[PDB]
């Protein structure tokens, strides 16, 4: 019930950051990153922000489990699963990329 | 079986443990150590089995 | 998207594997310890450039690779001047022998020189300092098993003269043969093949 | 991989990148307008550049400034190239590097109306002002992993990997690249199989194929014993030429008719 | 002047065991005292362990020559 | 280029600097830390990425992963 | 261009000297690794209608053990070398007992010339090298291993050791840049030495055919 | 110490061999520059 607060705060921060990036791109401040065009660098920054947010949420979720938890036991044993699966189940799924 | 000897690390083995003290006596029960085919330390996982 | 990727992979990889198998289906290792094909055309004078099965090979590390020149000197030289260290490691009936006798000293110096030559060879052969290499026999595990069986108790002075180690290694370097034959070309190939392992 | 001092500083590597990147008029030109100006001194447009220098038509090919500075060019070499490429048949009156507009003036001296259109088109499409063909654009990225960082044995002994600038093209020339100065002729590979066979040799092709195969097989973290890779590489480089694993490379070998029909082309080989 | 390896490869060992088992199953004399077993394959394995199989292996070389090795001559792997 | 005015020279220098910077490639992202010892160079500087945690050497550039 | 042309000529000369040293012809340690400053001070550094003109920087080098065997290194000025040029070169070579040579052509020679080159093969060996291929010494490249041209005696010894027919050995066509670099012809085996990661060193052989 | 000294003098012999090779190569260059001259 506290991990939910942390996750919600992180998601809101990520949303605010991406909105700020969009505002900067609209008002012509985000300069093109070397080797990429304006749209390419805009997309790269957005993707990096979302991935950082997802990783932060997953780490917060992982650190909030208990030794008696079964997902964590099966992941540390490596029998079937991974940390990203626990992250998607509890914290947040993430970006649904295609191609 | 037999007298096997091998060393393996557990999945949840903190990297900042070998450098500091408590190298041969791990609080988290990691750093699998088998001598003469007898488990001594560590928790078995996919890394060892 | 994932399902479509899996479907196309399941259709393409089969053809790839089929083409790979139909191009090397007759290659084999003849009794002449050499890899050929149906036309008896030699493809490799030794399987895998070494002539070893892929099942009995484990990852290892090269101690004499990527050291520091000062560290390499204080780990493979066997200083024979500090008699206190010898008394701590070897027994009294060997310290006097390793001190007085100069043949042992010359032999050990030659061993260190050969070690330096091997280190130079490794450096010129394995650039970028990659210690992780694959070799047949895991020597560290064997040494550990010997310690655990014979009860070495690594605190007391052991009874093992360095000359014994030098001669034993030289004989084992002779017993392990890959290119049989006393011909100069045969010996050159034998030295080349069983080079990294030695 | 840069060889000279350019490997360290990016200032002296940008010129190398520019000289290895194909630049044409289209990349530096911004506008191109033809005018039927009768008298050269009349100058229907307002430009005080022809009277100082001194056919009833001309081309005003004004160039861009930002692109020209990015590639670091000068109108002198552009005029020299545009005059030598088409023989002593035109007269390009370049402009000084002090005015704001980078205007030019191409005139022809000795059906004639479309000749200017054709010549402007065929020069704008392809002229090779500074660079080689094939190579479209070149990147400039520092090495983050040991697979591309420079390694030198230090006097103390430790390897001490060095971080040096390296380029990443998008084409295949190799031959014309290695000859360029400030280019290590020892570590600049090509990432192509058929190209190296016409530059270095069959053994180099074998090694390159081995490295590429190992790269593509170890990218997902998997591991395959090197013996298998070596055996495949040798079988593909046994007859000197690069035999293709397809039906067009294995059936050419003198294996036997019963073995060729198994793979493919049954009735043809029989 | 034999240059082939002095060890018995797995392929040769398997084929020799199978052939000896087939021969024993066809009412052939054994070359070891039977401790009370009947499976011909087990008898063949016992003979191989006892190094009494009356078979000699002919290893053909790529050139065309060959070498005759006897089961009781070279070392057995397993 | 040498005969150009001060303003023109400054503009050309700025354009050249911008072009040189834009020609570069963006560095690979990651969490840089000194808790992992790279086996290819012996240094502690490196960057990790969680996905299995891939280890990227900072100075030596040793690439590895931990499960 | 002037400076670039001088640099290209110097690089070509260095590559040719290195090539001759690799084959076995005795060469100065000085000219083997001479810098460009002495090259300028020697010829004149004005290739554009000046002193360092082609056909004057040619070099004749004799073999190490066979001082009677030499080889010329010409530099015809014609971008598209014809047959008359090679004809006069061969005619002038006929005065000496020389047999081998090396032609450095600006651009690819006409197909009609290759026929003449191969026609005089049994009597006067001569090959060609485009200047674009001489600006770099391939033998020093990382991918290319260290080749060694073998003698007939040791080739026969090898074939007899493994009891393997020379036809069964790997193949390498004469068109291979390494093959032309060492001048190896048909019916001749070349030793290869590659750094083996699983065995340290591994030596293989390839017969040219 | 004496073995070190004899190794040093052997290196001196190799240095003298390098000198003789250099002088021989110069002595043939004096003749070969004549051909290089008459060629043009």
PDB file of C-alpha atoms in Angstrom, chain D residues 175-176 178-179 181 185-189 196-204 206-208 210-211 225-227 234 237-241, chain G residues 4 7 132-133 135-138 140-145 147 167-173 176-178 192 194-198 204 206:
ATOM      1  CA  UNK D 175      40.024   0.021 -51.006  1.00  0.00           C
ATOM      2  CA  UNK D 176      39.653   3.777 -51.413  1.00  0.00           C
ATOM      3  CA  UNK D 178      42.527   2.462 -46.505  1.00  0.00           C
ATOM      4  CA  UNK D 179      44.592   4.587 -48.898  1.00  0.00           C
ATOM      5  CA  UNK D 181      45.933   9.213 -44.672  1.00  0.00           C
ATOM      6  CA  UNK D 185      45.565   0.473 -42.501  1.00  0.00           C
ATOM      7  CA  UNK D 186      45.768  -2.372 -39.996  1.00  0.00           C
ATOM      8  CA  UNK D 187      42.477  -2.343 -38.043  1.00  0.00           C
ATOM      9  CA  UNK D 188      39.905  -0.906 -40.491  1.00  0.00           C
ATOM     10  CA  UNK D 189      37.795  -3.948 -41.368  1.00  0.00           C
ATOM     11  CA  UNK D 196      37.367  -8.355 -48.672  1.00  0.00           C
ATOM     12  CA  UNK D 197      37.939 -11.166 -51.169  1.00  0.00           C
ATOM     13  CA  UNK D 198      38.753  -8.531 -53.792  1.00  0.00           C
ATOM     14  CA  UNK D 199      40.982  -6.523 -51.449  1.00  0.00           C
ATOM     15  CA  UNK D 200      42.766  -8.608 -48.827  1.00  0.00           C
ATOM     16  CA  UNK D 201      42.526 -12.297 -49.711  1.00  0.00           C
ATOM     17  CA  UNK D 202      40.825 -15.604 -49.052  1.00  0.00           C
ATOM     18  CA  UNK D 203      42.358 -16.107 -45.615  1.00  0.00           C
ATOM     19  CA  UNK D 204      41.258 -12.623 -44.585  1.00  0.00           C
ATOM     20  CA  UNK D 206      37.854 -16.617 -43.649  1.00  0.00           C
ATOM     21  CA  UNK D 207      38.835 -14.624 -40.574  1.00  0.00           C
ATOM     22  CA  UNK D 208      36.267 -11.895 -41.279  1.00  0.00           C
ATOM     23  CA  UNK D 210      34.498 -16.122 -38.503  1.00  0.00           C
ATOM     24  CA  UNK D 211      34.352 -12.803 -36.661  1.00  0.00           C
ATOM     25  CA  UNK D 225      32.145 -23.677 -29.295  1.00  0.00           C
ATOM     26  CA  UNK D 226      34.652 -22.140 -31.707  1.00  0.00           C
ATOM     27  CA  UNK D 227      35.404 -25.529 -33.278  1.00  0.00           C
ATOM     28  CA  UNK D 234      36.995 -23.663 -43.606  1.00  0.00           C
ATOM     29  CA  UNK D 237      36.805 -21.358 -47.956  1.00  0.00           C
ATOM     30  CA  UNK D 238      38.338 -24.659 -49.040  1.00  0.00           C
ATOM     31  CA  UNK D 239      38.230 -24.281 -52.833  1.00  0.00           C
ATOM     32  CA  UNK D 240      39.678 -20.777 -52.815  1.00  0.00           C
ATOM     33  CA  UNK D 241      36.452 -19.142 -53.919  1.00  0.00           C
TER      34      UNK D 241
ATOM     35  CA  UNK G   4      48.934  14.588 -52.852  1.00  0.00           C
ATOM     36  CA  UNK G   7      52.470  11.450 -51.244  1.00  0.00           C
ATOM     37  CA  UNK G 132      45.166   2.097 -56.217  1.00  0.00           C
ATOM     38  CA  UNK G 133      46.173  -1.338 -54.924  1.00  0.00           C
ATOM     39  CA  UNK G 135      48.764   2.578 -51.618  1.00  0.00           C
ATOM     40  CA  UNK G 136      48.381   0.018 -48.808  1.00  0.00           C
ATOM     41  CA  UNK G 137      50.398  -3.047 -47.847  1.00  0.00           C
ATOM     42  CA  UNK G 138      47.839  -5.777 -47.232  1.00  0.00           C
ATOM     43  CA  UNK G 140      50.331  -5.893 -42.550  1.00  0.00           C
ATOM     44  CA  UNK G 141      46.552  -5.993 -42.121  1.00  0.00           C
ATOM     45  CA  UNK G 142      45.188  -7.671 -39.012  1.00  0.00           C
ATOM     46  CA  UNK G 143      42.965 -10.133 -40.867  1.00  0.00           C
ATOM     47  CA  UNK G 144      45.699 -11.252 -43.283  1.00  0.00           C
ATOM     48  CA  UNK G 145      47.990 -13.764 -41.540  1.00  0.00           C
ATOM     49  CA  UNK G 147      52.323 -16.208 -45.480  1.00  0.00           C
ATOM     50  CA  UNK G 167      45.368 -32.292 -55.433  1.00  0.00           C
ATOM     51  CA  UNK G 168      43.724 -32.902 -52.051  1.00  0.00           C
ATOM     52  CA  UNK G 169      45.214 -29.768 -50.444  1.00  0.00           C
ATOM     53  CA  UNK G 170      43.138 -26.559 -50.266  1.00  0.00           C
ATOM     54  CA  UNK G 171      43.023 -24.241 -53.279  1.00  0.00           C
ATOM     55  CA  UNK G 172      43.901 -20.576 -53.762  1.00  0.00           C
ATOM     56  CA  UNK G 173      43.535 -18.814 -57.091  1.00  0.00           C
ATOM     57  CA  UNK G 176      44.152 -13.511 -54.942  1.00  0.00           C
ATOM     58  CA  UNK G 177      45.797 -10.194 -53.979  1.00  0.00           C
ATOM     59  CA  UNK G 178      48.136 -12.047 -51.623  1.00  0.00           C
ATOM     60  CA  UNK G 192      49.676 -20.125 -43.652  1.00  0.00           C
ATOM     61  CA  UNK G 194      47.115 -18.070 -38.028  1.00  0.00           C
ATOM     62  CA  UNK G 195      46.926 -17.299 -34.312  1.00  0.00           C
ATOM     63  CA  UNK G 196      44.716 -20.113 -33.031  1.00  0.00           C
ATOM     64  CA  UNK G 197      42.593 -19.205 -30.036  1.00  0.00           C
ATOM     65  CA  UNK G 198      42.068 -22.864 -29.107  1.00  0.00           C
ATOM     66  CA  UNK G 204      47.826 -24.932 -42.795  1.00  0.00           C
ATOM     67  CA  UNK G 206      47.161 -24.080 -49.749  1.00  0.00           C
TER      68      UNK G 206
END
